[PDB]
Design an enzyme around this catalytic site. Structure first.
Site, PDB file in Angstrom:
ATOM      1  N   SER A   1     -38.622 -15.162 -14.143  1.00 52.72           N
ATOM      2  CA  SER A   1     -39.126 -13.835 -13.633  1.00 52.72           C
ATOM      3  C   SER A   1     -38.632 -12.773 -14.763  1.00 52.72           C
ATOM      4  CB  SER A   1     -38.053 -13.699 -12.505  1.00 52.72           C
ATOM      5  OG  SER A   1     -36.686 -13.967 -12.477  1.00 52.72           O
TER       6      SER A   1
ATOM      7  N   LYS B   1     -41.407  -7.440 -12.304  1.00 56.12           N
ATOM      8  CA  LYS B   1     -41.711  -6.387 -11.306  1.00 56.12           C
ATOM      9  C   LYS B   1     -42.681  -5.407 -11.894  1.00 56.12           C
ATOM     10  CE  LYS B   1     -36.706  -5.547 -10.203  1.00 56.12           C
ATOM     11  NZ  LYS B   1     -36.014  -6.626 -10.629  1.00 56.12           N
TER      12      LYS B   1
ATOM     13  N   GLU C   1     -35.835   3.138  -5.494  1.00 53.61           N
ATOM     14  CA  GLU C   1     -34.867   2.887  -5.492  1.00 53.61           C
ATOM     15  C   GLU C   1     -34.572   1.736  -6.545  1.00 53.61           C
ATOM     16  OE1 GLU C   1     -36.821   1.274  -3.765  1.00 53.61           O
ATOM     17  OE2 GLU C   1     -36.435  -0.770  -4.409  1.00 53.61           O
TER      18      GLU C   1
HETATM   19  C1  LIG Z   1     -35.776  -7.660  -9.982  1.00 51.35           C
HETATM   20  C2  LIG Z   1     -35.619  -9.128 -10.472  1.00 51.35           C
HETATM   21  C3  LIG Z   1     -35.469 -10.283  -9.741  1.00 51.35           C
HETATM   22  C4  LIG Z   1     -35.026 -10.123  -8.067  1.00 51.35           C
HETATM   23  O1  LIG Z   1     -35.955  -9.362  -7.194  1.00 51.35           O
HETATM   24  P1  LIG Z   1     -37.245 -10.412  -6.466  1.00 51.35           P
HETATM   25  O2  LIG Z   1     -37.662  -9.021  -5.716  1.00 51.35           O
HETATM   26  O3  LIG Z   1     -36.543 -11.206  -5.623  1.00 51.35           O
HETATM   27  O4  LIG Z   1     -38.033 -10.905  -7.708  1.00 51.35           O
HETATM   28  C5  LIG Z   1     -35.464 -11.441 -10.141  1.00 51.35           C
HETATM   29  N1  LIG Z   1     -35.647 -11.720 -11.349  1.00 51.35           N
HETATM   30  C6  LIG Z   1     -35.699 -10.509 -12.427  1.00 51.35           C
HETATM   31  C7  LIG Z   1     -35.979 -10.852 -13.758  1.00 51.35           C
HETATM   32  C8  LIG Z   1     -35.798  -9.260 -11.936  1.00 51.35           C
HETATM   33  O5  LIG Z   1     -35.689  -8.251 -12.722  1.00 51.35           O
END
Ligand SMILES: *Cc1c(COP(=O)(O)O)cnc(C)c1O
Ligand SMILES: O=P(O)(O)OCCNS(=O)(=O)c1ccc2ccccc2c1
Ligand SMILES: O=P(O)(O)OCCNS(=O)(=O)c1ccc2ccccc2c1
Ligand SMILES: *Cc1c(COP(=O)(O)O)cnc(C)c1O
Ligand code: NA
Ligand code: NA
Lengths: 394, 258, 394, 258
Positions: free
Chosen positions: C376, C86, C108
């Site tokens: 992620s 993010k 948000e």
């Molecule tokens: C916010 C988040 C996601 C989900 O959001 P996407 O917009 O689909 O990427 C996935 N993995 C992590 C670690 C997150 O913080």
């Protein structure tokens, strides 16, 4: 004898029971050979880069220094895998253990960070890891204990003594004295019996080496001073090492002052303790007038080592490095300041180093100075601690 | 030193080994500890190994870890230990008294001063648990200056070099470790070849047959600590019974050395 | 009209009240100009490198694939400042806000990660940040709420509707419709009204670009497939983008299956929802037969967006990308597996992607395949959740 | 459409503006809502703006957010709303009825089908809150095919281009926003210049003086929602008193338009 000098001036040595000397000698020999082995260096570099995430950034903090002539950079060990600098040396030690043909790892831990680092390194490299932790620490560090177990490590509570770090340190040595044949003792800081102070420094040396290359690239000169917190001394010596021969570069170590040096509730043995012989080394330590070992107090659990690395005591004695202290409140203020002005949540340990840097800047706002603070780790782990404190104050 | 020489000389003329028990000074209390020690001696102890309560006995197993803890619960300090030692010496003029120390307690107020205190109180030897031969210089020198025997440890894997060092630097008796780890035959011959101080086997010795085996193997005697301490720990609620058991155990272990 | 296409096939658009169109038009124009501005790109790159810690490592996971013909690499966004991907796009959006002369940020957040990311970016770049969060989420994410406030952000609970993410999304838009003159709405994913899906993709594109350069360097070829979890779609499109034209590279998005698709308790609108119009876009979503919007369920709070980015719906429709689902239990197993075998604690969100990769490997052990999973984020934040679950099972 | 044309024609001959109240269908219940609506009409309402309860009214302030919530608490569904609309139409043959919708409810079962349902029930216009002119094509086309007026919004910052679009695409009446934000003069002349549908000012209208001001400025009338809804919210415990207050407020607002 030994291959390397076990002493830094009068500090250091190998004060362990006779039965453990072969273990120390084997380790020193394995280390010396590993340091000359291109293959070992390549594997270690591979892990540091592709697994741990090195090199770490060197962040210029423009907001926090606004209105002053101080330029402050933060060496980002908080971005290293694991969230702290500890990961660097556990990877090297794990490789050493494998070089010696060991398949098991023994580690001690207080706040739990070293335990977590030891566990992750062991999981990655296929080593059976068992960790010793003071009972009072196990109780207060449930998160870290669960992390260690998730990574396959065996966590063993220590109820003897004060049931804290020093007690875990003893239990680790007791175990190793009877299992060194197949187990390697992954000591958590730049202290203990030779060759640990030396090995840990060399396995954290990249912090300072990277900082030098990065600051030269960004500023075209070396810093006026590099600042680091001192619990046991590993992140500090890691930052200091490559600058020791650069005499124009100040080396400042920051010990925890707790509630204040005069209160007796602190963790600053280097400047306010007394030289003694414990944990396999001769070094300044927290001890009673009778010679009994005492605990180190600090709002930060990670700066709880009741003694300090021998090389720091040495650098201090010859005046190459200067050591100061920062109280709980000063560290808390630096923590709050970095969060609000740079969007970085620092470990309360690291906050001590930042706090002194902030003091150097604020006390002499017009003094032109290029400072580098070793941000040894991130503070997500300290948000509750900081939260509870702040609320209890209205 | 002197007292050990006389002891081993006498024991040799009687073809028997020495039985040396270990106990932590002040465990479970100063008074009871003094009684325990007198019981040990009256029961047949040839010499004593006495520990000074230390905050971090990193070379001791749980049994002795608790002995130190009980002593601390009693407020036993190093100074009180030296008061106890002086009294023990005043009561028993010939029994060799060896201290089991940890480096910091010896280094605390000065190494030389510590051995000087040992000498004025009547101590015969000092074994510093966390001081290997490699770091022994200052300790063995201070010991010798005050006629105190510096006890060296001969581990089970000891190589020739170590054996030679232990043989030349040690005095009183050579500590022959039964195993690696903490408290809870060929080397014996090598030690004798190098004129080392008489060997006393220690660690894990808890039965009469172990004492006889040690002597048979060529050792001058055997040391037993945890086995002794366990008796103290199991009879804390019954002081009198504690002494009774100690006497029965010590007499049994000593009989095995004859 | 607009400068760029607001649609990806039939999905996307700008379904916002008329009053908000000027805000979207301004943002699109600022974005297009910024993309052609070398100075903007340089500043963004500077922040990504020296503040966030890019590039992130690409870790080969040898242990987890032992005994199979699968070679698995993990793109380490877990090592990015903030602990999740993010951070990349909030830095870009923050710069855009400043390019437009805005001094305030509206955001948000559900799980709280975007709120934390928005807060840190705002603290660093001197923006006044206010965050909207569902009341039920504020209650369940105390840690993240405190982090946001430590970084100077204003946290506002939303009690309307189900008091969760979608409700926070509404409140954000309500606020912006009356303050866009001085405030920028930092949307948290690759969804919402144009130009957000496009902007967020371009500001996360470095994930895929780095992965391509790194895999080419380490393997000399492109991966057979890149796998990423899909909550809103940002990390997934970030990984996918640079590989879209490499037709041999499979693109696999993983939606949360919760307790199981057949239970109706899941968060997989793309493959099991129905196309609707909400949150400013036409895209598949969780909705009742009557058209009322429903919540997305998953053990992972971060995969709670009740809809999905328009570009994902599009890539799916044309068969360029494939989407699947992974249940709570499958994600939990992948989480436990990575901790124990690689010493990496993955975010439960990311664990969904890893879980599918593990399935591809385990179902066809002898199939030679080079896979890249977008890790992620890190899962230190999920240790309690995982802990409570495991214990309740004996 | 038809009904709006007749209404404005009649209102013009009497030199008065229109007063149009807004309420959420089914708030606080179906029965009470039907009574509220009959009260509004009997009290002087020239036309009605009726909202269909939606889960996420992202263009409404707290007052209407709660109206939707109360309606949902009553289990009010879109299908029941259409049943209510048919009845309202069967009772009042000439009053223009406009719906306030959110895109998903219109798109849900097909856009064309939604407007077809509006026509068979007697609805005159539909304003989709989250559909700007840029996305209006499918909606305005479906509306026109079923003789439903598609309501367009003229914001306060509307540029010439937008004014021209709103003027050509809209029917029934042009929604003149009083301000930006959510529910809770020169443009009027431009709209007339472009032959736009009569303007009805909405948002923030809660007092008689605001209605007179709107008409004076050249608007064909004014819409009031939250002010009406607040009366419902404050008298939930007293149904009868609720109607009484509504009648007094509506009659006051309508009198101001004359
Ligand atoms: C916010 C988040 C996601 C989900 O959001 P996407 O917009 O689909 O990427 C996935 N993995 C992590 C670690 C997150 O913080
Ligand atoms: O019967 P046990 O409990 O096995 O052993 C008794 C220990 N007492 S002792 O002999 O005074 C003793 C204590 C600890 C030591 C550590 C390292 C070198 C030698 C040592 C000698
Ligand atoms: O008196 P109030 O509460 O300020 O406003 C009453 C709102 N009712 S309404 O006219 O049916 C209405 C509701 C929401 C809208 C959002 C965007 C375009 C136009 C809209 C029209
Ligand atoms: C362990 C730790 C320290 C203290 O140990 P040193 O060995 O003195 O570095 C400091 N900072 C962090 C973040 C730590 O985890
Ligand atoms: Na310390
Ligand atoms: Na989703």
């Amino acid at each position: 004898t030994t291959l390397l000098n076990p002493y830094f001036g009068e500090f250091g040595g190998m004060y362990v029971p006779q039965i453990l000397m072969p273990a120390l000698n084997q380790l020193e020999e394995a280390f010396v050979r590993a340091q000359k082995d291109p293959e070992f260096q390549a594997q270690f570099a591979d892990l540091l880069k592709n697994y741990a995430g090195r090199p770490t950034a060197l962040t210029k903090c423009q907001n926090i220094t606004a209105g002053t002539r101080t330029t402050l950079y933060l060496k980002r060990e908080d971005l290293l895998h694991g969230g702290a600098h500890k990961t660097n040396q556990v990877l090297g030690q794990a490789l050493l253990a494998k070089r010696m043909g060991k398949s098991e790892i023994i580690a001690e831990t207080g706040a739990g960070q070293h335990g977590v680092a030891s566990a992750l390194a062991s999981a990655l490299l296929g080593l059976k890891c068992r960790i010793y932790m003071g009972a009072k620490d196990v109780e207060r560090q449930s998160p870290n204990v669960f992390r260690m177990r998730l990574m396959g490590a065996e966590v063993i509570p220590v109820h003897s003594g004060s049931a804290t770090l020093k007690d875990a340190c003893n239990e680790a040595l007791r175990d190793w004295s009877g299992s060194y044949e197949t187990a390697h003792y992954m000591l958590g800081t730049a202290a203990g019996p030779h060759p640990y102070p030396t090995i840990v420094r060399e396995f954290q040396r990249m912090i300072g080496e990277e900082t030098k290359a990065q600051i030269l690239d960004k500023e075209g000169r070396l810093p006026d001073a590099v600042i680091a917190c001192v619990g046991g001394g590993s992140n500090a010596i890691g930052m200091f090492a490559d600058f020791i021969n650069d005499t124009s570069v100040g080396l400042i170590g920051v010990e925890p002052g707790g509630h204040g040096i005069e209160t007796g509730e602190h963790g600053a043995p280097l400047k306010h303790g007394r030289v003694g012989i414990y944990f396999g080394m001769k070094a300044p330590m927290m001890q009673t007038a009778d010679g009994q070992i005492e605990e180190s107090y600090s709002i930060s659990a990670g700066l709880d080592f009741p003694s300090v690395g021998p090389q720091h005591a040495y650098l201090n004695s010859i005046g190459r490095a200067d050591y100061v202290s920062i109280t709980d409140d000063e560290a808390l203020e630096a923590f709050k300041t970095l969060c609000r002005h740079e969007g970085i949540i620092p470990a309360l340990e690291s906050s001590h180093a930042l706090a002194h840097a902030l003091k150097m800047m604020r006390e002499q706002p017009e003094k032109e100075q290029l400072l580098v603070v070793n941000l040894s780790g991130r503070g997500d782990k300290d948000i509750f601690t900081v939260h509870d404190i702040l609320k209890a104050r209205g | 030193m002197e007292r050990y020489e006389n002891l081993f000389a006498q024991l040799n003329d009687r073809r028997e080994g020495a039985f040396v028990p270990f106990v932590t000074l002040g465990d479970p209390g100063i008074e009871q500890s003094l009684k325990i020690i007198d019981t040990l001696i009256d029961a047949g102890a040839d010499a004593l190994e006495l520990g000074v309560p230390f905050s971090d006995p990193l070379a001791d197993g749980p049994t002795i870890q608790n002995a130190n803890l009980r002593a601390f619960a009693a407020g036993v300090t190093p100074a009180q230990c030296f008061e106890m030692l002086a009294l023990i010496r005043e009561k028993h003029p010939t029994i060799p008294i060896g201290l089991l120390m940890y480096a910091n307690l010896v280094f605390n107020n000065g190494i030389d001063a510590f051995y000087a205190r040992c000498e004025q109180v009547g101590v015969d030897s000092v074994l510093v648990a966390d001081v290997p031969v490699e770091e022994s210089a200052p300790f063995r020198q201070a010991a010798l200056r005050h006629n105190i025997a510096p006890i060296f440890i001969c581990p089970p894997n000891a190589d020739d070099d170590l054996l030679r060092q232990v043989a030349s630097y040690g005095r009183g008796y050579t500590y022959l470790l039964s195993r690696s780890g903490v408290t809870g035959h060929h080397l014996i011959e090598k030690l004798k070849e190098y004129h080392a101080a008489p060997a006393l086997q220690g660690f894990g010795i808890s039965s009469p047959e172990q004492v006889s085996a040690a002597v048979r193997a060529g050792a001058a005697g055997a040391i037993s600590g945890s086995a002794i301490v366990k008796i103290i720990e199991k009879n804390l609620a019954s002081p009198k019974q504690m002494l009774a058991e100690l006497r029965s155990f010590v007499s049994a272990m000593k009989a095995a050395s004859r």
